[PDB]
Amino acid sequence: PPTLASLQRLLWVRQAATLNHIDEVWPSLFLGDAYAARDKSKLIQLGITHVVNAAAGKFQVDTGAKFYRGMSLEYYGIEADDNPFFDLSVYFLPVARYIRAALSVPQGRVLVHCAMGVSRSATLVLAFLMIYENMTLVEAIQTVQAHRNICPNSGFLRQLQVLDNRLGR
Template sequence: MNPQCHIVEEAHYSKIIPGLYVGNFRDAKDQEALHNNRITHIVTIHDHAKVPLPHIEYLTLNSPDNPTANISQFFHKATEFIHECRIHDGRVLVHCIAGVSRSVTIAVAYLMSVTDHGWRDCLRAVKQARQVANPNFGFQRQLQNFENTELKEVRKRIKERYSDTLREQDTSAIQQLLDKCNQKPESKDPEEDLYPLAYNAYASQPPGDMPPLDT
């Protein structure tokens, strides 16, 4: 196992920062691992989301892993759920089917909201902690638009509600992941898998009407 990858003991989900984990649907059903790692909350996001386990608080979000899906509609609700959990010393697992696209997108949106880092750095940090992380083109575009339009106000609202609780710690944790990422010998550009777009690209079209990726 790559020593740079923070894989949680007895599970396949990945610790991103203290209290925040990303994984797949099997991880969310592994009661022994959930218990051993003291997971108290789960964000489950896929197109057939269900609440399978007692004694865990759930946020269920129904979304396909499709570039045209409007995953950004869940950013505010998920951020509030995750932060409330962590503020009260809980641990939250964010999962989708594979733990690659939808769950990573939600985690990145949360990290953007509670730290001083933008979407690119937050995604690079998550990739450092979970190497399979790779949101689809449309989800990355929505993260970029979130940063350019709503993020400043979201951060202000979080600061007003929670003061700066966890912000310094979380910003530092992301920076540590970025430092590790920058120290690795890279065989390719670390941003090669990111999809930079001009601000307001496709602005006339809502997320559900985005053009499909070229095939």
């Protein structure tokens, strides 16, 4: 049973010098930023079939279904703030399920992005791994963090612990 400090330490202890716009963090599963989000072309390259906008909203990364018009891809918008007091966890299961049914598609290649792809979307990716890849939070992080610097905020971490916990039992 880890403490917060241990996770944050971990989140610190393993971080490369730079951060890219997108990153395959798991087979057919990408963590990206809003730049990569609107990078229609690389999207094409990568063969993304599903975009998870965890920074969705007119007041945030307002890409929506319309931005991808003509493009052969499906969209999920989650109107979340990167605030410790924002309950991302209410999105934890449904998104795990969304991402799951996608990757279950042969072509299934999912992008999960927020603004900078390190916290809000990072977190939703974590939960998915714990929930559907049989991982734990630390394992999730070590796995994910092998390809992309991440750092869910304290409250998102606290959110994950709880999830780790429900799953422990």
